[PDB]
Amino acid sequence: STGSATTTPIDSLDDAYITPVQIGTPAQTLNLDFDTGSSDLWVFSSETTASEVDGQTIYTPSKSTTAKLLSGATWSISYGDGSSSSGDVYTDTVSVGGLTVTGQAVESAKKVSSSFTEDSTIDGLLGLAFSTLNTVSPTQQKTFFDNAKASLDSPVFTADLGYHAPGTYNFGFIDTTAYTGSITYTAVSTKQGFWEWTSTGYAVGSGTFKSTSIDGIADTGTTLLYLPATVVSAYWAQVSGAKSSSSVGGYVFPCSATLPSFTFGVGSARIVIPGDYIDFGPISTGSSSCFGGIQSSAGIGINIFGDVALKAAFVVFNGATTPTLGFASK
């Protein structure tokens, strides 16, 4: 089998992407944030504290004839941005772009933190990291990809995120019309439960390539590109008027400045992030100060190849017995 679904930015800055997902019988369609940095599929629901729901579409398991309570199961997750959610668990039928999993763990939120309530466009998350990170207790549950894998024509999914435009998540096949040149594959460590890999270096604009190992994760659920402070400093030093603002919480720059591209290495291959991808607009309405899309990972504890990086590529998440990652230009 295969599946193919369009993913759409939630706003004009690509702050996140939402993908429609069918849950239950008859189908209830929710728009979920596909997140290769986590491993829980959780939704706003009929069980979510009413004061914590504000415009989201909810899953109502009682209206689904295929929903079954996963008795005794609870879940609770906290993300890197300090947001969180928790609740209980149903199994139900879940379909993404034509691909159907029966008995998928659907984690029903009883509680969500403020940032989730405040974002009316995201109805939940669909985790695509490794199932070892799944938070369901007492019995860890598998991701949608893990459950689908054996049925797929090929045990892979691909992320093709758009710049200020929709893109595509495919399951079970590689669309050879969706990228230019060849796909370069690179090794993955699953030891932290992430699609963790080692970039071979970077360049700033037309500058020469610096060969240096950068360990990080391919994370569709993180908006920006987070790299070591040395790397990030070298980038913003090439932007007139840029500075790191503690009050803002990272690098900002005047919107009158031209942003250089940023190149990262995948083996001997190179992915070029155009300068425009690194502009995340005024820090506040009417401000001449713009937020940068490349920021320091210092104090995160890991480097994150978020959407800023991934949307410059066609990315293969290869879930073969030994997982790997593939990157192509497009």
Contact 53, 109 (CB under 8 A): no
- Nearest partner of 222 among 299, 290, 305, judged by Cα: 305
**Does residue 290 sit in the same domain as residue 143?**
no
Contact 182, 328 (CB under 8 A): yes
Q: Is 166 helix (H, G, I), strand (E, B) or coil?
A: coil
CA distance 81 to 214: 22
> Among the three residues 174, 204, 236, which one is the final residue of a domain in this structure?
174
CA distance 311 to 160: 7
207 phi, psi to nearest 5 deg: -70, 165
Contact 224, 291 (CB under 8 A): no
For residue 231, the one-letter residue type is V
* DSSP assignment letter at 142: -
Report how far Cα 170 is from the mean position of its chain's Cα atoms.
Answer: 14
**Does residue 222 sit in the same domain as residue 163?**
no
- Nearest partner of 123 among 58, 28, 211, 197, judged by Cα: 58
**Does residue 239 sit in the same domain as residue 202?**
yes
Range of the domain at 44: 5-174
* DSSP assignment letter at 183: P
**Does residue 153 sit in the same domain as residue 9?**
yes
Report how far Cα 299 is from the mean position of its chain's Cα atoms.
Answer: 20
Q: What is the sign of the dihedral through the CA atoms of 184, 186, 192 and 193?
A: positive
**Does residue 152 sit in the same domain as residue 183?**
no
230 phi, psi to nearest 5 deg: -60, -45
Q: Token pair of 53, please?
A: 């729901």
> Among the three residues 148, 174, 200, which one is the final residue of a domain in this structure?
174
DSSP calls for 72-123: EEEEEEE-TTS-EEEEEEEEEEEEETTEEEEEEEEEEEEEE-HHHHT-TT--
CB-facing half-sphere around the CA of 49: CA atoms within 13 A: 12
Q: What is the sign of the dihedral through the CA atoms of 27, 30, 35 and 41?
A: negative
46 phi, psi to nearest 5 deg: -60, -15
Annotation marks residue 84 as catalytic = no
Active-site position among 14, 33, 35, 123: 35
Strands 41-43 and 28-35: unpaired
Q: After which residues is the chain broken (C to N over 2.5 A)?
A: none
Active-site position among 39, 85, 95, 199: 199
Q: Token pair of 18, please?
A: 């939402």
DSSP calls for 270-296: EEEE-GGGGEEEESSTT-SEEEESEEE
**Does residue 141 sit in the same domain as residue 9?**
yes
Q: Is 165 helix (H, G, I), strand (E, B) or coil?
A: coil
Instruction: For residue 186, give the CATH number of its domain.
Output: 2.40.70.10
Q: Token pair of 263, please?
A: 């190149």
Q: What is the resolution of this structure in A?
A: 1.6
Domain count, the chain: 2
Residue with tokens 């410059």: 312
**Does residue 184 sit in the same domain as residue 287?**
yes
Q: Is 64 helix (H, G, I), strand (E, B) or coil?
A: coil
Structure-determination approach: X-ray
> Among the three residues 174, 209, 238, which one is the final residue of a domain in this structure?
174
Neighbouring residues of 183: CB distance < 8 A, sequence distance ≥ 6: 174, 314, 316, 326, 327, 328
Annotation marks residue 199 as catalytic = yes
**Does residue 292 sit in the same domain as residue 203?**
yes
- Nearest partner of 310 among 152, 213, 197, 177, judged by Cα: 197
CA distance 67 to 50: 22
Q: Is 16 helix (H, G, I), strand (E, B) or coil?
A: coil
**Does residue 312 sit in the same domain as residue 238?**
yes
- Nearest partner of 199 among 186, 184, 180, judged by Cα: 186
DSSP H or E run through 308: helix 307-310
**Does residue 307 sit in the same domain as residue 222?**
yes
**Does residue 231 sit in the same domain as residue 133?**
no
DSSP calls for 35-63: ETT---EEE-BTTS-GGG-SS---B-GGG
Q: 3-state secondary structure string, 227-269?
A: ECHHHHHHHHCCCCCCEEECCCCEEEEECCCCCCCEEEEECCE
For residue 122, the one-letter residue type is I
DSSP H or E run through 309: helix 307-310
**Does residue 146 sit in the same domain as residue 225?**
no
- Nearest partner of 292 among 243, 246, 247, judged by Cα: 243
CA distance 165 to 13: 10
